[PDB]
Amino acid sequence: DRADILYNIRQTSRPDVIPTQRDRPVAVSVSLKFINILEVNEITNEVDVVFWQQTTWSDRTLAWNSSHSPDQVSVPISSLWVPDLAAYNAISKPEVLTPQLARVVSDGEVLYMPSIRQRFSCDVSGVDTESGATCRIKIGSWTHHSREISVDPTDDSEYFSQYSRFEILDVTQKKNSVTYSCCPEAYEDVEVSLNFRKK
Amino acid sequence: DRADILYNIRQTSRPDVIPTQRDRPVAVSVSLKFINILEVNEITNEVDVVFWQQTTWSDRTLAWNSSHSPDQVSVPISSLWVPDLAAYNAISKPEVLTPQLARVVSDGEVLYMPSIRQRFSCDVSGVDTESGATCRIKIGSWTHHSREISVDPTDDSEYFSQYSRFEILDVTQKKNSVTYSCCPEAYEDVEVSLNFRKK
Amino acid sequence: LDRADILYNIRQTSRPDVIPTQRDRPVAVSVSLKFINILEVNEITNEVDVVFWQQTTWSDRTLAWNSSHSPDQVSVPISSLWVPDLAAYNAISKPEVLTPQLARVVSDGEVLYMPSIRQRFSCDVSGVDTESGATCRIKIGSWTHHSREISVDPTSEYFSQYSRFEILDVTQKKNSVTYSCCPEAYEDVEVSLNFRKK
Amino acid sequence: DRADILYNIRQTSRPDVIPTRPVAVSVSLKFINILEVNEITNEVDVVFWQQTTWSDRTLAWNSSHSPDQVSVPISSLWVPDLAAYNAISKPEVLTPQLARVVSDGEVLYMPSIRQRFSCDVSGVDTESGATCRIKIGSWTHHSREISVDPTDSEYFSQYSRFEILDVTQKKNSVTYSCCPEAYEDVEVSLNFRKK
Amino acid sequence: RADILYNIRQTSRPDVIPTQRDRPVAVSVSLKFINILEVNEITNEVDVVFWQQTTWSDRTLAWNSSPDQVSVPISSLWVPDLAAYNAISKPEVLTPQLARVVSDGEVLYMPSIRQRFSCDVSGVDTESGATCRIKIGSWTHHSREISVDPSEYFSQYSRFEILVTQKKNSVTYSCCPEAYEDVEVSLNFRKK
Numbered sequence: 001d002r003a004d005i006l007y008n009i010r011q012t013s014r015p016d017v018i019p020t021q022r023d024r025p026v027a028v029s030v031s032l033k034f035i036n037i038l039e040v041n042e043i044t045n046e047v048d049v050v051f052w053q054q055t056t057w058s059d060r061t062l063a064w065n066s067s068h069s070p071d072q073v074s075v076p077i078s079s080l081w082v083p084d085l086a087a088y089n090a091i092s093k094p095e096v097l098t099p100q101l102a103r104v105v106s107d108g109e110v111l112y113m114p115s116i117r118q119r120f121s122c123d124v125s126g127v128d129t130e131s132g133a134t135c136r137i138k139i140g141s142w143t144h145h146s147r148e149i150s151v152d153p154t155d156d157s158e159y160f161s162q163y164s165r166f167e168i169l170d171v172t173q174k175k176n177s178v179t180y181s182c183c184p185e186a187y188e189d190v191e192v193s194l195n196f197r198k199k
Numbered sequence: 200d201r202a203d204i205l206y207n208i209r210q211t212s213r214p215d216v217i218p219t220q221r222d223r224p225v226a227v228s229v230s231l232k233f234i235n236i237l238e239v240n241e242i243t244n245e246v247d248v249v250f251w252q253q254t255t256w257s258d259r260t261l262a263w264n265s266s267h268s269p270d271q272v273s274v275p276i277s278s279l280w281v282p283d284l285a286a287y288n289a290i291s292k293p294e295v296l297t298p299q300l301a302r303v304v305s306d307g308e309v310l311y312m313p314s315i316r317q318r319f320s321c322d323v324s325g326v327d328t329e330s331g332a333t334c335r336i337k338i339g340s341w342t343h344h345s346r347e348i349s350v351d352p353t354d355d356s357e358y359f360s361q362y363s364r365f366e367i368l369d370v371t372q373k374k375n376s377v378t379y380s381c382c383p384e385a386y387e388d389v390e391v392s393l394n395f396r397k398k
Numbered sequence: 399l400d401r402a403d404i405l406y407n408i409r410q411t412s413r414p415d416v417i418p419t420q421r422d423r424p425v426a427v428s429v430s431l432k433f434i435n436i437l438e439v440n441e442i443t444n445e446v447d448v449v450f451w452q453q454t455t456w457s458d459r460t461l462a463w464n465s466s467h468s469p470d471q472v473s474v475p476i477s478s479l480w481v482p483d484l485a486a487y488n489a490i491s492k493p494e495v496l497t498p499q500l501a502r503v504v505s506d507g508e509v510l511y512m513p514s515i516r517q518r519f520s521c522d523v524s525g526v527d528t529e530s531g532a533t534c535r536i537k538i539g540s541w542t543h544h545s546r547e548i549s550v551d552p553t554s555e556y557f558s559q560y561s562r563f564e565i566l567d568v569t570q571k572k573n574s575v576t577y578s579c580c581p582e583a584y585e586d587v588e589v590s591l592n593f594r595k596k
Numbered sequence: 597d598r599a600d601i602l603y604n605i606r607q608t609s610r611p612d613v614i615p616t617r618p619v620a621v622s623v624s625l626k627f628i629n630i631l632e633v634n635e636i637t638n639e640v641d642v643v644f645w646q647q648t649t650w651s652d653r654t655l656a657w658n659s660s661h662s663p664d665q666v667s668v669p670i671s672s673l674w675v676p677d678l679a680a681y682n683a684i685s686k687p688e689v690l691t692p693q694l695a696r697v698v699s700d701g702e703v704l705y706m707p708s709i710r711q712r713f714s715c716d717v718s719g720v721d722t723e724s725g726a727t728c729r730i731k732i733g734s735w736t737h738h739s740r741e742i743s744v745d746p747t748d749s750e751y752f753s754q755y756s757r758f759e760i761l762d763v764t765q766k767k768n769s770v771t772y773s774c775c776p777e778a779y780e781d782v783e784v785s786l787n788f789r790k791k
Numbered sequence: 792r793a794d795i796l797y798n799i800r801q802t803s804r805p806d807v808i809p810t811q812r813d814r815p816v817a818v819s820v821s822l823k824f825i826n827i828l829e830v831n832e833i834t835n836e837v838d839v840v841f842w843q844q845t846t847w848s849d850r851t852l853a854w855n856s857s858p859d860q861v862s863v864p865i866s867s868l869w870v871p872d873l874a875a876y877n878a879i880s881k882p883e884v885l886t887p888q889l890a891r892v893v894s895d896g897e898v899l900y901m902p903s904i905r906q907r908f909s910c911d912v913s914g915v916d917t918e919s920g921a922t923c924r925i926k927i928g929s930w931t932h933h934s935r936e937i938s939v940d941p942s943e944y945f946s947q948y949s950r951f952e953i954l955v956t957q958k959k960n961s962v963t964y965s966c967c968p969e970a971y972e973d974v975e976v977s978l979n980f981r982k983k
């Protein structure tokens with residue numbers, strides 16, 4: 001049934017179409033687990049970090065009966081709709097470090113969690129402070145407003161490399177909504193706050 | 200129904216044909232919102248900047264009925280005709296940092312606004328004074344002259360990063376039309392004047 | 399059967415997007431790293447840049463043919479094949495693959511893929527100047543298939559005379575790990591590269 | 597109709613087939629910037645417009661009651677396999693890779709390119725200047741299949757650390773040891789100096 | 792000439808080694824060194840530019856000699872999967888990726904390549920200089936499938952000078968029972 005399931009997903013799902021249920025927004029969960037902090041610059045206020053970007057959402061049309069079938073499959077993301085998330089204050093392309101496969105569950109829920117390396121512009125002052133710096137990253141949909149996509153956040157140092165020259169103090173995630181000057185609509189995002197200190 | 204709207208587009212879009220409309224030029228709007236200034240060099244006169252390149256134009260073929268269907272949708276740009284804009288004094292290709300989706304309205308109006316990192320050759324003198332420097336970026340079509348394509352420009356620190364170590368004194372944008380030595384036709388560009396200084 | 403015939407059949411039966419499980423059991427991937435070079439280390443940042451042959455074998459019994467009177471093996475580009483989704487967990491760059499992306503398929507269905515790879519890691523570089531030397535640990539495991547669908551197991555001679563470093567020992571350990579977020583276990587091979595400066 | 601002209605092109609251009617009587621290719625470089633110079637390694641980094649023209653009569657159409665010119669993606673056209681022999685990086689193409697096609701089958705491709713070369717940089721701080729020679733030619737076509745013909749500080753950047761004294765172009769034929777066919781190249785000479 | 796490309800597209804099998812009978816494909820390789828660009832005697836690494844002349848025969852491509860040759864995209868043809876074992880970067884190919892095809896089936900591919908190698912740089916400044924050896928061979932075809940058999944274009948603006956030899960070698964590795972043929976290129980050069 002596993003090739004069957006991939007087949008059913010590809011015949012049934014269009015990657016270029018938002019899986020909106022009954023003209024409700026598509027609820028996406030976003031969550032970052034930091035793995036490393038590689039380059040910090042206090043003169044230019046730029047940081048280099050590696051993290052797992054956990055992204056989950058639902059496409060109920062994908063679902064299948066798993067009484068005698070596998071409960072899950074791994075699928076190339078090029079066969080799915082994936083939300084067009086962006087980090088607003090990113091100053092580089094995000095470098096994907098892991099195979100780009102999503103996990104689909106028989107109920108129609110999807111998990112995509114690449115490990116990503118990326119550079120951001122953010123407040124770095126206090127890095128050499130026992131209070132540490134707090135760097136804020138904002139992530140949301142680039143071209144879908146809140147009527148279509150809604151972004152909700154789900155040991156902060158649990159998988160953090162210990163060989164990093166930095167140490168994490170806390171990670172906190174909060175939901176925001178913003179309307180920009182060019183356009184009438186609002187865009188939901190998550191601000192992740194990364195509190196870290198040099199060692 | 201968002202799916203039915205998109206198939207229609209995929210069927211009739213013609214990515215390689217200017218939606219020219221009866222030998223009148225396509226009227227393109229171009230507008231930059233500077234987001235960050237990352238590096239500057241007074242001796243080489245080079246600049247590294249991140250900006251939103253907002254681009255709008257009409258494709259009539261793309262229109263549909265929004266009465267019982269949605270007003271607009273996100274489309275991959277690989278599925279559309281896109282203006283062949285180039286920045287004349289660019290010295291790198293643009294690194295596109297965001298998903299390459301454009302917004303298409305049922306009236307055929309297309310919005311495409313990517314965050315872009317690029318490096319330019321321009322006048323950096325003054326960057327360390329209070330008066331600041333004035334760097335000019337020129338954007339036009341590369342292969343469509345005045346009759347085929349027209350570009351028109353349409354708060355300057357509204358989206359600028361507060362963690363940048365530069366700041367914007369003013370942004371101004373004026374239209375222009377130039378004939379080159381090689382060929383008789385004229386080309387339109389938008390001239391953008393970034394007046395900024397080191398904080 | 400000729401080489402063309404074998405490739406034709408592989409293209410007819412291969413399904414690059416779908417794991418080739420035998421009934422119930424997990425695909426048993428084998429992995430061993432053969433280190434060729436250690437190019438840049440940083441004692442301050444704890445980052446290494448290494449070159450290695452990633453020898454990877456596994457079985458896809460659907461590909462099999464009778465080779466009594468035909469070739470026993472062919473080379474196939476990996477896009478024609480299902481390949482395991484292995485990741486180095488503590489890598490901080492993509493793998494630069496240096497060799498032609500070709501796999502070797504045996505008539506019984508065994509597959510061998512062994513790319514030469516240059517990659518950068520985040521590991522312990524302390525003591526690289528010491529007699530004890532440094533011990534960098536590289537962790538490799540399936541990224542999206544848990545232990546019931548993929549298992550990985552471990553299977554200095556070709557290390558460059560010209561590197562600025564010498565190898566002391568290379569050991570491997572198997573781990574199985576369930577993570578905070580998700581209910582499954584994921585297997586990996588931990589390789590320990592014990593090296594020091596000449 | 598402009599759509600109609602492209603449709604015709606797609607089913608009329610064999611991108612893999614040269615259209616021949618050697619194809620006559622015109623090459624000229626208009627320099628936009630000199631970005632780096634390294635007097636010790638003899639390396640230069642430059643930005644230039646590559647004007648490339650050639651005829652593809654197979655592509656022609658009727659100009660009356662018809663648009664005289666269209667913009668076409670080069671991926672859909674044959675294009676000369678030009679290469680710079682003293683290049684030491686791949687060309688970064690800074691512009692959209694579209695050609696323009698006239699109704700009489702004349703073709704224009706003029707990308708903006710950044711590229712690094714190995715050439716003589718001695719004298720760049722001299723009043724006389726330095727003279728950097730770039731040689732361009734077809735890589736796999738000999739004289740009987742392709743000839744290259746060559747057709748100023750005019751578009752050169754005011755903000756460059758350097759200025760152009762003179763640009764000159766010559767034609768050459770060369771036979772290499774490996775193969776007995778002849779290859780034509782246009783040698784472009786750049787006399788420039790630090791201001 | 793359009794017809795020849797049509798046939799080649801028609802009969803050419805890019806993924807299938809074109810072995811005749813039971814014998815291996817004879818691949819000729821030779822490097823023409825054009826430029827040595829960087830050198831690091833500390834790390835023993837070099838960055839060079841060379842032309843790689845690679846030639847071999849594929850008879851599924853032949854035509855009744857119409858002109859003798861045509862230029863083809865290598866994407867249209869089987870190409871030998873040579874790799875340089877002591878490479879530490881991917882090849883950066885600087886020329887159009889086009890192969891010349893003779894009517895008899897001879898194929899010639901010669902790109903200009905820029906690559907960094909790991910080799911012996913010790914003494915490059917010395918009168919003796921250093922000597923880098925670049926080993927080149929098929930990565931996944933053993934000696935029964937592929938056999939590999941082996942200075943006037945150097946740039947005068949290079950900061951380096953060349954005092955070049957080529958040798959055949961055949962290697963059986965610990966993992967596997969077959970032998971892999973290679974060519975070792977030996978290059979003695981010093982700082983100018």
Ligand SMILES: Cn1cncc1/C=C1\CCN=C1c1cccnc1
Pocket residue numbers: 088140141142143180182183187300301302310311312313
């Ligand atoms: C700045 N920003 C944050 N999240 C999304 C955006 C981009 C905007 C703001 C409004 N218009 C859009 C848009 C619409 C269509 C295509 N691309 C961007």
Ligand SMILES: Cn1cncc1/C=C1\CCN=C1c1cccnc1
Pocket residue numbers: 287339340341342379381382386694695696704705706707
């Ligand atoms: C320099 N420039 C500014 N805007 C567009 C250009 C490019 C030029 C100048 C005129 N001829 C063209 C051309 C013609 C055909 C194909 N590509 C470019």
Ligand SMILES: Cn1cncc1/C=C1\CCN=C1c1cccnc1
Pocket residue numbers: 101102103111112113114539540541542577579580584
């Ligand atoms: C950290 N790690 C090691 N091996 C795999 C992972 C990633 C995780 C573990 C939890 N679930 C996954 C997953 C599942 C589906 C898609 N992507 C990631």
Ligand SMILES: Cn1cncc1/C=C1\CCN=C1c1cccnc1
Pocket residue numbers: 733734735736737772774775779889890891899900901902
């Ligand atoms: C050095 N050069 C200048 N123009 C062409 C060349 C390359 C050579 C030398 C002769 N024949 C070739 C060739 C033939 C087929 C494919 N690639 C290169």
Ligand SMILES: Cn1cncc1/C=C1\CCN=C1c1cccnc1
Pocket residue numbers: 500501502510511512513876928929930931964966967971
């Ligand atoms: C190390 N080396 C030198 N020349 C070729 C090689 C690669 C080898 C050695 C034996 N087995 C392989 C192989 C076989 C199939 C696919 N990939 C690699």
